Design a protein around this nucleic acid. Structure first.
Lengths: 121, 193, 85, 60
RNA sequence: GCCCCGGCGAGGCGCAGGCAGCCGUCGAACCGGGGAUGCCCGAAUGGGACCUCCCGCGGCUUGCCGCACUCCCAGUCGGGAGGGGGAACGCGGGGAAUUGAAACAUCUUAGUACCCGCAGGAAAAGAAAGCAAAAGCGAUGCCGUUAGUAGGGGCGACCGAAAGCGGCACAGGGCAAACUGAACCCCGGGCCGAAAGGUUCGGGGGAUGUGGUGUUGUAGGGCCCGCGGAGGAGCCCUGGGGGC
RNA sequence: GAGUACCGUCGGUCGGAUAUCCGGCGGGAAGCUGGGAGGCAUCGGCUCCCAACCCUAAAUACGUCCCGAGACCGAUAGCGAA
RNA sequence: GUCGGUCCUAACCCGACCCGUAACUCGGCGUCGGGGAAAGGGAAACGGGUUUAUAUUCCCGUACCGCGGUGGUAGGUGCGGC
């Protein structure tokens, strides 16, 4: 199990995150890909970052947690890239995704944020 | 983004999260064969700068070589004393290039493009080498790497036209000091290096 | 091989003539690369006979040579006359 | 034998004629050991022409 | 030695002056161009060689196709690459001794002979993190000079450049990144078209970034602003003429 | 455009001399308010340039060959072989 | 068809992979696959005659092995001896 993972999110959170991504894709705005996500975080337009654990090499996404913790944006983990990409609307898999302009997911993101904070602390 | 951060992580790995990663990775690499093909580069910024795309026809190969220099074999006939040494010799090619050549042996239908450093130990060094299939149509349909299907680019790594070979031949110095390295070494009787 | 290419030549020597008379045998010169079975066919077709036995030897000139015995219904002299001798 | 003549014929007639000339050549080689010294050259080259022309026909 | 198209125009059957005979005027031999057949070994390759010969497995109807090793794209089918050869010339590595110094050890012979590997009809180099000096040049490569000079060396024997000046020949382009975000590439089958090319179906890849923009120095490019909206230089041959 | 520029040390090589180029080992940056060169090191001034990725014709070398020539030999000569 | 090769393994050898080497047509452990004995192991034929020149090979006479078949029985469902 890798080392860019700081804590253990359960089925609860992981599945809610996949569904929030699917809903935000079909209603709001979704930035797909590590680089799009990174730029969103650098400029501040990112309201939630979903990251994958099935990644190798770790040097791809090992910069995101210590950056989102600074910019104060929440981030969750999920165990596969194929599922995340299928949710985002791709046939290839995604390692990271950013949710912008949520629609019909707002309360899901509320709860995800609160539980992420409770878990980190 | 995502590329400068990788560059930063790797510019000094003892200081970043890369040192212990490399410890474990080597624990596992030492059991692998000397030439092993892989799915994805370890230093993607560096690969993509050296020329690497995610198309069909590109192959990535890790190579393990031993460190240090040469030990000459002993001489049967009589020598003068200036010619008896056996131990403290070093090669005139670099280990990067030697690794490239081993990979080129193992994959004969291919051609080398470049290579990059990926780890050290006390006994071994590790290089990741990029290779290209010059008979793939996806590769003959791209003007950046369609030159490589030519009739004068086979044996590239062996004659010395890769970057490591040019470095070891002296084609990074241009004026005073480099009077004896162009247009070639044989042209001047090995008198450069 | 194929019929009609197997047989090169018939022999006409005193030994071969003796055998024609006595044993009801024919003697042929044949392509090295043919076997007893191909020789059997070849003779059967090119001459419309039934064959009993085939014996072969390679010579000291590089030629395969066949002694061929037919069934007593037929007669060597007949085909030896059908040919030249 | 002349390609003009042979080209008026069918594949089976050609096969038959080849077999016939093969047999005549065998018996001539036989009687040679024991006049017109050219029978053999001429028959060989006849068969050669026949085979070439049959191959052309089958290739069309 | 077999076939076709052309030329030449009567004899022909190799070095090679014979006996006997055949081919050719329905155009030969000969010459130029193109096709067919093409035993076994050999990279030698379905598997084996104390003798260039043997032993086999699938699938279809005696006849045939396929089946080495290492690899790429795929993947239950298939499609492709390499391997060996070549006088001298070429790129990259490894590397002696005789000999000379009137002995010899540093030096010389010599980055030589020879060895290992990789390419071609040419290879290699090549577009300044350069040269220079109060003035200036403008990628590489070859000739003539610079010059037995600067300079190395038991400072011994000996070794040994470049810039510049005079000429041959001339030519410049592309990535990575920033900013965008699937707007993209390939295979196979089908319909237009003479073709160069264009349009639909099913698969392989690609968010670990396919495509676009972009490429440099007393800076260049992107984002923002305003104004303006000559990529139109090139591909093909159903065509009509010319020259070689 | 980073184990890169650079610094010390060892071996080889060069006309390259405290001032050539190649390689091993041990250390190691800045990164456009930036960075390199200018024949010992360092300080200042001035002048020139932007490395660590790629392609590229012409002028050149050869002659297992061809055309064409010759103050070349003329059968113990000339290629070993008329 | 019956003599011998062709089959089996021995001491030994090669190939592929693997590790080394600046490299290889060089060096080598292990795994796998394959070769290696005309005096070792090992299905089966003996006499007479015939030719200028062959014969356990051709002819006569009398026989034996291995594959495949046809047809009957033993047996499947039978006995004798402490």
């Amino acid at each position: 199990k890798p080392s860019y993972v700081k804590f253990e999110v359960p089925q609860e959170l992981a599945e809610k995150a996949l569904e929030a991504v699917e809903i935000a894709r079909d209603t709001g705005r979704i930035r797909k890909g590590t680089n799009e996500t990174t730029k969103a975080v650098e400029r501040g337009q990112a309201k939630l970052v979903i990251i994958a654990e099935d990644v190798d090499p770790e040097e791809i996404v090992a910069h995101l947690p210590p950056l989102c913790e600074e910019k104060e944006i929440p981030y969750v983990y999920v165990p596969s890239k194929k599922e995340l990409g299928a949710a985002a609307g791709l046939e290839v898999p995604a390692a990271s995704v950013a949710i912008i302009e949520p629609g019909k997911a707002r309360e899901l993101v509320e709860d995800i944020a609160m539980k992420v904070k409770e878990l980190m602390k | 983004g995502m590329y400068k951060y990788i560059r930063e992580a790797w510019k000094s790995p003892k200081k970043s999260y890369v040192g212990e990663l490399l410890k474990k990775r080597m624990i596992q690499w030492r059991r692998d064969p000397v030439v092993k093909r892989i799915e994805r580069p370890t230093r993607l910024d560096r690969a993509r700068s050296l020329g690497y795309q995610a198309k069909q026809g590109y192959v990535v190969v890790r190579v393990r070589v031993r460190r240090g220099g040469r030990k000459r074999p002993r001489w049967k006939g009589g020598r003068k004393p200036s010619k008896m040494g056996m131990v403290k010799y070093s090669p005139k090619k670099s280990l990067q290039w030697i690794a490239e050549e081993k990979a080129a042996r193992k994959f004969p239908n291919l051609e080398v493009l470049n290579s990059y450093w990926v780890g050290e130990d006390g006994m071994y060094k590790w290089f990741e080498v990029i290779m290209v299939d010059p008979h793939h149509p996806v590769i003959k349909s791209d003007p950046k790497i369609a030159w490589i299907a030519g009739k004068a680019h086979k044996g590239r790594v062996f004659r010395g036209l890769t970057s490591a070979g040019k470095r070891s031949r002296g084609l990074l110095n241009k004026g005073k000091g480099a009077e004896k390295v162009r247009p070639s070494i044989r042209a001047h009787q090995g008198k450069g290096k | 091989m194929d019929p009609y290419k197997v047989i090169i030549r018939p022999l006409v020597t005193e030994k071969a003539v003796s055998l024609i008379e006595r044993e009801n045998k024919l003697t042929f010169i044949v392509d090295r690369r043919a076997t007893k079975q191909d020789i059997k066919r070849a003779v059967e077709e090119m001459f419309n006979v039934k064959v009993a036995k085939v014996n072969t030897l390679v010579t000291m000139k590089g030629e395969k040579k066949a002694y061929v015995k037919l069934k007593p219904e037929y007669d060597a002299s007949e085909i030896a006359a059908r040919l030249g001798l | 034998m002349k390609p003009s003549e042979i080209r008026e014929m069918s594949i089976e007639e050609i096969d038959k004629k080849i077999r016939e000339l093969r047999l005549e050549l065998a018996k001539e080689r036989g009687v040679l050991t024991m006049e017109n010294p050219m029978v053999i050259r001429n028959l060989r080259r006849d068969i050669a022409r026949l085979l070439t022309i049959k191959r052309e026909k089958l290739r069309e």
